[PDB]
Design a protein around this nucleic acid. Sequence first.
DNA 1: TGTCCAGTCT
DNA 2: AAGACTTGGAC
Length: 206
Amino acid sequence: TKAEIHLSGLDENWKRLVKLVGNYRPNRSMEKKEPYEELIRAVASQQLHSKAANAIFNRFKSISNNGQFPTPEEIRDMDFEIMRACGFSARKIDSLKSIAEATISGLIPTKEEAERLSNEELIERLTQIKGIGRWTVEMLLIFSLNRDDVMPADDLSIRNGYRYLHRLPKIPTKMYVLKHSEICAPFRTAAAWYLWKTSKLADYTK
DNA sequence: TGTCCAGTCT
DNA sequence: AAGACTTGGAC
Ligand code: NA
């Protein structure tokens, strides 16, 4: 892709990381899903390591409508106890219900509608919902709406990516990631994907 | 027969 | 706002 080509040519560390990792093969498993579904997966993935986040999300998608993902109506109506059994905190359950209501109301738009809005508009609009921050919308931008120039600086694994990439002693700050990732445009979504891959390199040190 | 730590609101 | 909040892997 043009993204790997651009990223290889940045500096020595990048050219090297991109060769270590290989071709840009993004996970597109969410690209045909409705925004509320990806938003919920992002909520599940807040804070925890991926194995925990997936265990929680997989239990949730498994409690519904002929194997199908729970509809917004179902979620709004759903007993709190069974969402607590999935592993969602009290705060996160509330967020889930807010998401259900915002989807029913149209504050959270359909896929077709969301695709017309700018990154900036989605962030401002969606972070009105309690439980949804910038990072959460950025996951939506990346995993569901095919936005190619998104760097989630607040992401713990993105920062550990730069700790790796730049052979840093300690783990860098949001602002540091903000400063250094500018060179990655207009492909900072691919940059992020490479960064997220650092943790699985034989080279990786915790 | 346990501890710690891997976004968000307040 | 300094800390509570959830489950699971690494020990
Ligand atoms: Na918010």
